[PDB]
Write an enzyme that holds these catalytic residues in place. Structure first.
Site, mmCIF file in Angstrom:
data_model
loop_
_atom_site.group_PDB
_atom_site.id
_atom_site.type_symbol
_atom_site.label_atom_id
_atom_site.label_comp_id
_atom_site.label_asym_id
_atom_site.label_seq_id
_atom_site.Cartn_x
_atom_site.Cartn_y
_atom_site.Cartn_z
ATOM 1 N N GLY A 46 0.809 -1.201 0.000
ATOM 2 C CA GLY A 46 0.000 0.000 0.000
ATOM 3 C C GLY A 46 0.847 1.256 0.000
ATOM 4 N N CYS A 47 1.946 1.204 0.801
ATOM 5 C CA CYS A 47 2.821 2.417 0.900
ATOM 6 C C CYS A 47 3.561 2.713 -0.421
ATOM 7 C CB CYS A 47 3.705 2.170 2.173
ATOM 8 S SG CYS A 47 2.713 2.021 3.615
ATOM 9 N N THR A 48 3.939 1.602 -1.150
ATOM 10 C CA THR A 48 4.585 1.751 -2.439
ATOM 11 C C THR A 48 3.574 2.297 -3.457
ATOM 12 O OG1 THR A 48 6.137 -0.025 -1.916
ATOM 13 C CG2 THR A 48 5.857 0.550 -4.221
#
Ligand code: NA
Ligand code: NA
EC number: 1.11.1.24
Length: 157
Positions: A46-48
Site C-alpha cells: 500500500g505504501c509503495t
C-alpha cells in the site's frame, strides 16, 4: 477559522530528517503549499502504491507551487533505499521518534491481541502557505487518494 487541526507551535521548528541526508522544518516551507502524507511502512504494497501515485502527479503539484513530503518512522537508510528503488522525486521524512506523527495525531490505538496496540494510521494533510492545516484525510484509502489530494489542493489554492 480555516484550520481543521491545531499543531503545537514547536512542531513547526522540529528538525525533520529527510531521505538524502538533509533536514527540513515545516516553517521552512512558509510561502508555499505543502502536502504531508503519513504511511505505516516503507516498501510494503500500500505504501509503495501510494508513493508511486504521488510521484506520478508531481508535475501537477508543481503547477500549484506545492511540495510533498511522505512520512513514516523508518530510518533514513530505509527511506534512501525505498526512494532509489521506486524512483521517488520527493523526500521522505524519517520520523523515527514519531514526533511529527504525534503532532498530527496519527498514532492511533487498537484493542487487538488482548493488548493496546499503537501504530501509524495512514493519513494526509494539506498545509497552507501560512502554516495552517486546512484539510485532513484519515484512515486513507490508497486507491484514488493522490488524485483526490491534488483536486483538493487546487480547490484551496
Ligand atoms: Na522498495
Ligand atoms: Na507551508
Amino acid at each position: 477559522t480555516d484550520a481543521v487541526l491545531e499543531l503545537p507551535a514547536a512542531t513547526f521548528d522540529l528538525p525533520l530528517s529527510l531521505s538524502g541526508g538533509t533536514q527540513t522544518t515545516l516553517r521552512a516551507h512558509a510561502g508555499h503549499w505543502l502536502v504531508i502524507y503519513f504511511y505505516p511502512k516503507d516498501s510494503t504494497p500500500g505504501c509503495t502504491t501510494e508513493g508511486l501515485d504521488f510521484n506520478a502527479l508531481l508535475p501537477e503539484f508543481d503547477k500549484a507551487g506545492a511540495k510533498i513530503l511522505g512520512v513514516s518512522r523508518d530510518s533514513v537508510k530505509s527511506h534512501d533505499n525505498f526512494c532509489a528503488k521506486q524512483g521517488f522525486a520527493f523526500p521522505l521524512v524519517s520520523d523515527g521518534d514519531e514526533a511529527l506523527c504525534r503532532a498530527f495525531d496519527v498514532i492511533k490505538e487498537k484493542n487487538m491481541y488482548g493488548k493496546q496496540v499503537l501504530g501509524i494510521e495512514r493519513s494526509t494533510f494539506l498545509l497552507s502557505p501560512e502554516g495552517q492545516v486546512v484539510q485532513a484525510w484519515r484512515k486513507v484509502k490508497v486507491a484514488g487518494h493522490a488524485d483526490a489530494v491534488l483536486a483538493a489542493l487546487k480547490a484551496h489554492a
